[PDB]
Structure formats: C-alpha cells, structure tokens
C-alpha cells in the first residue's frame, strides 16, 4: 500500500520444509534508520533467483507450441529459408519469454 522501498540482505535459508505449507523459511535483515519498517507488517521481498549471464529473450508472440507441448521457433536460415528450431521456454518477463 506504500511506495516505501528498502534494501536488505538474506541471512539464513532454513533447511526444514514446513510440513503444513510445504515451504522453507528465509530470514532477511533490513536497515530501519527512520523506523518506518514496523514489526509484524506484511511486506513483499524481491529475492533474486539466480543470474543468467547469457539469457536469451525473444518477443513472446514468436514462440509456437506443438501438440506434444514442445515449444519451437521459426528461424531465418541460410538462403532466407525458414527453419524450425525446437526450444524450451523458461519464465515470462514483460512481453518476452526467457529461453
């Protein structure tokens, strides 16, 4: 509900999955010099999920899917000929798919 943004660091990643919710707990320490961050407040944390040095992003409309669910992409081959290269698609960012 607020534009209040803060940065912090991840400290601890629990190893025991919660039995009821099937989740693992993580703890992050955040500076609160103004006292804005209040205990108990519900918040959202943007945790990075790893870095890809050679991420390939293509326009999302440029992905086809076959009857088996295998995704494929039309490619401009030598001699201006359209080639079908199969592809495995990752996550969805904006108007582009991560390949």
């Amino acid at each position: 509900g607020t534009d209040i943004e803060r940065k912090g660091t991840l400290l601890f990643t629990d190893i025991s999955v919660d039995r009821s919710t099937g989740q693992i707990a993580l703890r992050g320490q955040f500076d609160n010099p103004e006292g804005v961050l209040l205990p108990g407040m519900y918040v959202r944390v943007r945790t990075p999920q790893g870095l890809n040095q050679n991420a390939i992003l293509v326009p999302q409309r440029a992905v086809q899917r076959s009857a088996d669910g295998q995704a494929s992409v039309m490619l401009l081959g030598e001699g201006d000929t359209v080639e079908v290269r199969q592809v495995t698609t990752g996550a969805m960012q904006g108007s582009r798919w991560q390949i």
């Binding site: 009821s20 099937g22 899917r65």
Partner: protein, 50 residues
C-alpha cells in the same frame, strides 16, 4: 487437413478455410491430489480459488 489439402489445391474453388478457431496451446495444471490433501488442502479450496 486432409480435406483442406485436397480442396485448396483444386482450382475449382476460390478459397476454403476452417471458419473456426485454430487449436491453441493450453496450460494443464497437474494437481497432485494426494500431495495437496496431505498438506491439508481440500480439492474444493483449490477449485474455488482457481
């Protein structure tokens, strides 16, 4: 596709097309009913939420 290949290549007809929506990719949700249930999750809750 059989009939459209046999027809669209035949010069007797100006054009022929499936006046209809083409198949689209779908996102099937594989719900492990047993897993969800053991965590205490009813299928009613999942169905209602979705």
């Amino acid at each position: 596709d059989e009939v459209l290949g046999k027809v669209n290549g035949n010069p007797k007809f100006l054009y022929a097309m499936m006046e209809g929506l083409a198949e689209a990719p779908q996102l099937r949700l594989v719900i492990d009913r047993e897993q969800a249930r053991t965590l205490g999750v009813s299928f009613e809750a999942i169905s209602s939420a979705l």
